Design an enzyme around this catalytic site. Sequence first.
Site, mmCIF file in Angstrom:
data_model
loop_
_atom_site.group_PDB
_atom_site.id
_atom_site.type_symbol
_atom_site.label_atom_id
_atom_site.label_comp_id
_atom_site.label_asym_id
_atom_site.label_seq_id
_atom_site.Cartn_x
_atom_site.Cartn_y
_atom_site.Cartn_z
ATOM 1 N N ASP A 11 -9.824 16.612 -6.560
ATOM 2 C CA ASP A 11 -9.973 15.375 -5.398
ATOM 3 C C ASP A 11 -10.987 14.196 -5.810
ATOM 4 O O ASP A 11 -11.584 14.419 -7.035
ATOM 5 C CB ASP A 11 -10.049 15.915 -4.106
ATOM 6 C CG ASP A 11 -9.968 15.080 -3.085
ATOM 7 O OD1 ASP A 11 -10.269 15.093 -1.928
ATOM 8 O OD2 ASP A 11 -9.308 13.861 -3.263
ATOM 9 N N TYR A 16 -3.888 6.195 -4.882
ATOM 10 C CA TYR A 16 -3.037 7.207 -4.303
ATOM 11 C C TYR A 16 -2.002 7.825 -5.429
ATOM 12 O O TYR A 16 -2.061 7.061 -6.320
ATOM 13 C CB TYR A 16 -2.287 6.831 -2.978
ATOM 14 C CG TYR A 16 -3.033 7.029 -1.732
ATOM 15 C CD1 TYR A 16 -4.491 6.822 -1.604
ATOM 16 C CD2 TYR A 16 -2.531 7.169 -0.627
ATOM 17 C CE1 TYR A 16 -5.141 6.768 -0.572
ATOM 18 C CE2 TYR A 16 -3.194 7.362 0.566
ATOM 19 C CZ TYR A 16 -4.715 7.139 0.709
ATOM 20 O OH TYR A 16 -5.279 7.107 1.863
ATOM 21 N N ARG A 69 0.862 -1.170 -0.042
ATOM 22 C CA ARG A 69 0.048 0.031 -0.023
ATOM 23 C C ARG A 69 0.891 1.222 0.063
ATOM 24 O O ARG A 69 2.070 1.260 0.589
ATOM 25 C CB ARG A 69 -0.785 -0.198 1.170
ATOM 26 C CG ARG A 69 -2.165 0.688 1.109
ATOM 27 C CD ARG A 69 -3.063 0.413 -0.036
ATOM 28 N NE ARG A 69 -3.369 1.768 -0.525
ATOM 29 C CZ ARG A 69 -4.478 2.475 -0.232
ATOM 30 N NH1 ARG A 69 -4.584 2.402 1.078
ATOM 31 N NH2 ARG A 69 -4.755 3.561 -0.824
ATOM 32 N N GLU A 88 -4.380 16.304 5.066
ATOM 33 C CA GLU A 88 -4.071 14.969 4.938
ATOM 34 C C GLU A 88 -3.302 14.568 4.186
ATOM 35 O O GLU A 88 -3.169 15.130 2.905
ATOM 36 C CB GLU A 88 -5.395 14.031 4.992
ATOM 37 C CG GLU A 88 -6.503 14.217 6.212
ATOM 38 C CD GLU A 88 -6.233 13.065 7.280
ATOM 39 O OE1 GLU A 88 -7.218 13.317 8.047
ATOM 40 O OE2 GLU A 88 -5.349 12.476 7.166
ATOM 41 N N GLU A 89 -2.498 13.499 4.178
ATOM 42 C CA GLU A 89 -1.313 13.063 2.991
ATOM 43 C C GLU A 89 -0.862 13.961 2.257
ATOM 44 O O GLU A 89 -0.903 13.704 0.954
ATOM 45 C CB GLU A 89 -2.211 11.872 2.344
ATOM 46 C CG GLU A 89 -3.200 11.094 3.475
ATOM 47 C CD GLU A 89 -4.072 10.140 2.589
ATOM 48 O OE1 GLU A 89 -4.763 10.372 1.773
ATOM 49 O OE2 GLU A 89 -4.124 8.955 3.178
ATOM 50 N N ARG A 99 -4.058 -0.083 10.421
ATOM 51 C CA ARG A 99 -3.036 0.163 11.717
ATOM 52 C C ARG A 99 -2.942 -1.114 12.580
ATOM 53 O O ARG A 99 -3.350 -0.948 13.687
ATOM 54 C CB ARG A 99 -3.478 1.433 12.360
ATOM 55 C CG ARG A 99 -3.791 2.604 11.538
ATOM 56 C CD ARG A 99 -4.290 3.985 12.352
ATOM 57 N NE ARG A 99 -5.291 3.793 13.120
ATOM 58 C CZ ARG A 99 -6.486 3.885 12.529
ATOM 59 N NH1 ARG A 99 -6.603 4.000 11.062
ATOM 60 N NH2 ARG A 99 -7.677 3.787 13.147
ATOM 61 N N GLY A 110 -13.662 19.675 1.337
ATOM 62 C CA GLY A 110 -13.183 20.039 0.116
ATOM 63 C C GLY A 110 -12.751 19.291 -0.918
ATOM 64 O O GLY A 110 -12.147 18.294 -0.901
ATOM 65 N N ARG A 113 -4.623 16.691 1.003
ATOM 66 C CA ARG A 113 -5.893 16.292 0.883
ATOM 67 C C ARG A 113 -6.791 16.785 1.953
ATOM 68 O O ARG A 113 -6.699 16.735 3.257
ATOM 69 C CB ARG A 113 -5.988 14.637 0.932
ATOM 70 C CG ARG A 113 -7.373 14.037 1.318
ATOM 71 C CD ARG A 113 -6.874 12.465 1.434
ATOM 72 N NE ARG A 113 -8.409 11.827 1.888
ATOM 73 C CZ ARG A 113 -8.467 10.496 1.816
ATOM 74 N NH1 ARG A 113 -7.240 9.872 1.647
ATOM 75 N NH2 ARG A 113 -9.555 9.987 2.317
ATOM 76 N N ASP A 114 -8.029 17.350 1.406
ATOM 77 C CA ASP A 114 -8.929 17.696 2.405
ATOM 78 C C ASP A 114 -10.097 16.664 2.342
ATOM 79 O O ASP A 114 -10.919 16.415 1.561
ATOM 80 C CB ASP A 114 -9.553 19.234 1.930
ATOM 81 C CG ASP A 114 -10.448 19.692 2.981
ATOM 82 O OD1 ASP A 114 -10.615 21.013 3.119
ATOM 83 O OD2 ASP A 114 -11.445 18.884 3.583
HETATM 84 CA CA LIG Z 1 -12.243 15.577 -0.581
#
Ligand SMILES: [Ca+2]
Lengths: 387, 387, 387, 387
Positions: free
Chosen positions: D242, D322, D36, D195-196, D70, D216, D211-212
Amino acid sequence: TYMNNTEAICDAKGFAPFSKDNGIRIGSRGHIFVIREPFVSCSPIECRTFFLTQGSLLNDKHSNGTVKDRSPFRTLMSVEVGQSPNVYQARFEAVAWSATACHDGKKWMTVGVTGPDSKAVAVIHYGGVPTDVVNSWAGDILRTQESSCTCIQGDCYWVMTDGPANRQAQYRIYKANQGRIIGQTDISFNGGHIEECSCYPNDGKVECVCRDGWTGTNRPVLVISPDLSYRVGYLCAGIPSDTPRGEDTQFTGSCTSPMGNQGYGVKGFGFRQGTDVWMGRTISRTSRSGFEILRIKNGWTQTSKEQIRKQVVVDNLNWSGYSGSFTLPVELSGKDCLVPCFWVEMIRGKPEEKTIWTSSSSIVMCGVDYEVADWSWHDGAILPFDI
Amino acid sequence: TYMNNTEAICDAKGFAPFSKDNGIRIGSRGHIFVIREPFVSCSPIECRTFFLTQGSLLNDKHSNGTVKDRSPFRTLMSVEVGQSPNVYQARFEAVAWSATACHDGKKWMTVGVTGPDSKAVAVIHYGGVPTDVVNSWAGDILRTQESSCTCIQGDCYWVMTDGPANRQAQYRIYKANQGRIIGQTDISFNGGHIEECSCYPNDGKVECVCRDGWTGTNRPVLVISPDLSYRVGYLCAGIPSDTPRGEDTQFTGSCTSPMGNQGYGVKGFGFRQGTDVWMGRTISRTSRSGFEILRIKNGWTQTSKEQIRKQVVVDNLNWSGYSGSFTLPVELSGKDCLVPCFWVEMIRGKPEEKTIWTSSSSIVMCGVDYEVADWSWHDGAILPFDI
Amino acid sequence: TYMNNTEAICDAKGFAPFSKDNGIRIGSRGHIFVIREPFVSCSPIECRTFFLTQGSLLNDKHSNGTVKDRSPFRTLMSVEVGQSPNVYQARFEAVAWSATACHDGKKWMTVGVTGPDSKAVAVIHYGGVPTDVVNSWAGDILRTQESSCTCIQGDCYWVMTDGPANRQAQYRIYKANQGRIIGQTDISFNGGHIEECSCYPNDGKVECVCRDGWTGTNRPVLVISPDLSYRVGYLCAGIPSDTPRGEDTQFTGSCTSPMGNQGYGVKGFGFRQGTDVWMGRTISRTSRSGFEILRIKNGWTQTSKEQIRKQVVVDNLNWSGYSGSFTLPVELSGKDCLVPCFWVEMIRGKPEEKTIWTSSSSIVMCGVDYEVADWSWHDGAILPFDI
Amino acid sequence: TYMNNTEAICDAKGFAPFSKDNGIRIGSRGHIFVIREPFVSCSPIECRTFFLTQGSLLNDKHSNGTVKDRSPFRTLMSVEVGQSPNVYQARFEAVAWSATACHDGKKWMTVGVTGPDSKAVAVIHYGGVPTDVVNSWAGDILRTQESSCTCIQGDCYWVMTDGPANRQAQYRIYKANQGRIIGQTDISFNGGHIEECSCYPNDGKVECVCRDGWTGTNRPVLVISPDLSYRVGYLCAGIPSDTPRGEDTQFTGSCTSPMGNQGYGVKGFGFRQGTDVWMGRTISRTSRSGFEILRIKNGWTQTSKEQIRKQVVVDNLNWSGYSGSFTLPVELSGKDCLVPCFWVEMIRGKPEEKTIWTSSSSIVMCGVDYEVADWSWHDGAILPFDI
Ligand SMILES: [Ca+2]
Ligand SMILES: CC(=O)N[C@@H]1[C@@H](O)[C@H](O)[C@@H](CO)O[C@@H]1O
Ligand SMILES: CC(=O)N[C@@H]1[C@@H](O)[C@H](O)[C@@H](CO)O[C@@H]1O
Ligand SMILES: CC(=O)N[C@@H]1[C@@H](O)[C@H](O)[C@@H](CO)O[C@@H]1O
Ligand SMILES: CC(=O)N[C@@H]1[C@@H](O)[C@H](O)[C@@H](CO)O[C@@H]1O
Ligand SMILES: [Ca+2]
Ligand SMILES: [Ca+2]
Ligand SMILES: [Ca+2]
């Protein structure tokens, strides 16, 4: 820089275990080459285990063993001592069904003999690339040591045999530098036979204990000088060290000609200890089973049979096979003498076992100034395999 | 430092075996890439075997062979000469369904062509990273050598073809330095066809023996000067060296245009020996079976058919295939001339065999100042596989 | 150059996860060695995971576990920390069924003990080659640490035990340089027992927290000076850290003799923090399950039981096993103190599980100036395997 | 020496294919990690592909995918770009279920976050050994980029998020040198979500397109100065990049706040081209399928929707996922500007496919001064697998 293998062989009282690959046990599930002749030779940085491959892997139909020894697939490859002859850590060396290899201090020189029986060709490689060639001079299965060759001050030497495996054959000593043949020599040894020599440097000369496959149960010996002058005969020792062979009591040693009516043989080795000698041999006088190493006092220069030491490395309930000599460069042992070491190939499968394949494992031993207890570091694989 | 491949090609009397990977035999159980075009090229430190992969492994359903040659998965990868194109020792090179590679002395430059047929793109890599690009200038399957390119004093050269595989196509010579295109050239060759060129440096120039897939059974030839000026035509030799082809007796050589009505072809190579020539070829005039290498006197400059030597490397009962040229850098052979070497791909499986896959093995040969006996170092795999 | 492991152990408030190999999960399909004692030791360039192998691979009939621990196949091998003990990335070290290893700054020194129970031999390797030997001086299963040894300014030290695993045995401290034994020492510890010592350099001395398999539930401790003078006894701490053991409340610590009637034990470790101590231990007082690491104030010099910190690394619902100490060389951490790290072996299969094999995985932790939250980085394999 | 990633991003007209691992196709038979986030980052000597592993191999029951993302097994490992994430060529990096990595010119620094959700720990590694730590400061799944971090003149920077994946979370910028945290910063972005982040150096500053995952459909952006001062907002561009997202026509861009009611999201990247912008995105506005990369004029500083170029790398009939940014060091490209490159992860198996596992493959692209034709370099694996 070139390796000064000018020193004398260290006087050792026994041999400590160096490595064990367990190639065959590992082969039950891993990707291991079905090999043969896992001989060892060292560079000033590491010792490697060279071997022959049919391009086959244990537990695969290609390990069918029916393929001729001298096939067009046989190749010489290698790994670091102790690692199994696995596909993924292997280094290709040369196309060959008979080989020899040694390092001169800078690069690796290897010699792969391949081609047809009546016109074989031995390709000399230097630094991972072919540099010179030797064609069969006698047109009958040209072959060589199957164990480490010997480099001394830049020049490397090795012995080659061309001719029948019975009656007289022809033997030659070759000398190269940087993969280039710069000298050779014919060996006069009428009545004598030479095969699969196990050599090593000693006092600036190259000593080899070979195999007489014609009529001798005692091993032929030839000391090579750097100018290719030489001496040749048999391990004086009053004890036979080949296989098959007769009993020690019914053997009268000879430094001159072969003794014993036995004709076959197996590759072996021996180390000069001043005037004494360390000679290896299968424990069984008839089979390639077990492996012991005896030290005979004055056995190198006298028809002596005075056993000073006996160390067992592979018990007689286990298969053995070929065995060869090699030396630990000074730059690795940190010694002032050349540590004598040997390897013992252990054959599993055909003909003594019921499998469709045949391969071997190995165990390496080295000099050491102490007596080492008897034990058995045998193969260990559980036969047969999924086939 | 840059590699001086300025010297002349060594005059060789035969070819000794360099290496054999046995990739396919090994693939029966190991993890090997189903490949194609296992061409060889050397750096001043080692020779590597490059090849194309579909990301598939022998004995896996992905080796289904139904995947188009020019698929979005095809990638160029490599290993050291002799090692099999196994997943675990492989080095990624570039996304490609057609490639070329050579080392300039410092780093490896590779050229992977990928993308769509009408707008393909050839990515140039230098030191393991993309540095420049070439887009299809003729919009019809841009392609290249499929064998070693050639670097001389820092600049590397290679030939590329864009256009139909039948009628006239367009051919170009490219020149780069450090992965950067610094010059190119259009090749005027009306009536002539050029594909999969096998080149090598000789006397400061780049010589290539290519493939005419349009109408010639004799191989096209073009000598490239460092300033991209050039000469082009056909191997003068009065003997056809492509496949398919007609009989030698019914062939009149030509240095100018193609001879023979045959249209297809196969990648081959050839080495200039002063005025003589070493030309390789399938033994069968119809199939990609067997492989021999003949030396024709004055065959490079005359419509000669005077065979001085004939050496068989793969007998006619065994499959062969592509073959290419490459040179041993001086820094490896230790010579003062460039040792000429070639590789012979051996194809197994579809279409000539009943398997659901198709792959190849290889055997590499190199110069050598001696005559080398005929023999056959064929693939050896036992088909079909577990499938 | 030699490694100056002269500094003090860094004062750490907790341990951050270093690596996890997941060897066994991976073994369900990959080619992994069935191992034991995956101890860690670092060179000034990298940390490696050493381990013992039977030459067997998980999911193969050879992992039959019925093979004796001290078999003629057991060998010490290694990989880089975090990688699984896979066949293809492994480095051979020495023939052994008990071992120790450390780097002195230049080369790796390893010590493999093999041979028969009554006359075992420990071979010392230096730079990938045997250099010296130690023969059983008490003729009853000669053995050593099974975790990193310790080099300080060129000389490396380690502890060895020869004699019964119950009643008094004999313990010795050995000192070498460049694989050559240059000094040794007998340890007077009547009534005390020493096994599998976990050492590390601290303030120019070698500290070790060992295992009393005779009658102590608290761990024996011995500080070795470079001249082989020493101090020995038990971790003062008023809390038992061996397994099996009694409850903490029913334990009165002692720096002198062993406390607790329990006799067995398991390899563990401990780190001096000035006067405090970090002591590891299975969470279960009866089984090799779970793993926690507690910090006791003044626990190194006082029969203290003042727990300052408790960090769980493996919850009690998961198997654990051996654990050992090692240090991060300064040249890697960039620190001015020696980062204390430990490894936790996690055993799966026999005897607590129904499989025909037994192996272990590992997780490594290191110093760190911060409190690290509790969690469980357990093995994870799903048993049984295809068998 | 440290890497001067001070230069500007090269102005590119398109992207040429760098590499393709075909990890999953290869996994049908080879030993490949179910991975991943196969993100790429380069050292001045080579580019590597980092990824997360569960210690599982494709076609093994452990790839059961039911294991939490995780989990206590997840680890960060790596191979050279293009090679598959195979067990035998892999390098261990750090225990982690979220990571980031970059090279500063001398050594590799990696950051593995592992541990429990409410108290996770991010371990910083430098030169293959842990050097510093960061504990969850907000106690709710501490995480980071999942793509290359950024080093500029010795100091490396990266972004971290701690808090819910919906409503406001907390975001921080970290700065280290030699694996040691030497500075950090809180990001004020109320109403915004990060994020990320996919970063890269540009004109001496660190630019990131993140990344929202809150509200968003346009990507958040933050330019970091070496003193940790910063600017943050959204890609001005009047086009949403996105996934999921609405149609371009029904979107009014904003450099300030998020636009679009969509809440989820996927990791993406973007490159500043002076004032223009290269923005990547799934072709499907609803699914992680296909992948195109559009260049919007003045899209970095204006709510522009003027598409200058559109290049498809993965057609909409194929799965994507991704994607991240990274730069080619100058010492590799030989350029005077930083070649912008990105990677596109391609997910196969659950949830969109019927297999018991889930993994991804990858394809890497790099700058290039030429327009590159559309095509599709998709995964290619044939599902399902033997399971
Ligand atoms: Ca988004
Ligand atoms: C298990 C297996 O394949 N053994 C075969 C045997 O059946 C066959 O008769 C022989 C001759 O080709 O080769 C191998 O011995
Ligand atoms: C053994 C096997 O899978 N062979 C298949 C064959 O069945 C199929 O018809 C063809 C077309 O997709 O591909 C392969 O030839
Ligand atoms: C699955 C398997 O092979 N297990 C065997 C078992 O059958 C046998 O009784 C025992 C003794 O040799 O060894 C292993 O436990
Ligand atoms: C092929 C296989 O093993 N699939 C299993 C499935 O049977 C099981 O119900 C589920 C829950 O544990 O895990 C996997 O999906
Ligand atoms: Ca004999
Ligand atoms: Ca033709
Ligand atoms: Ca105890």
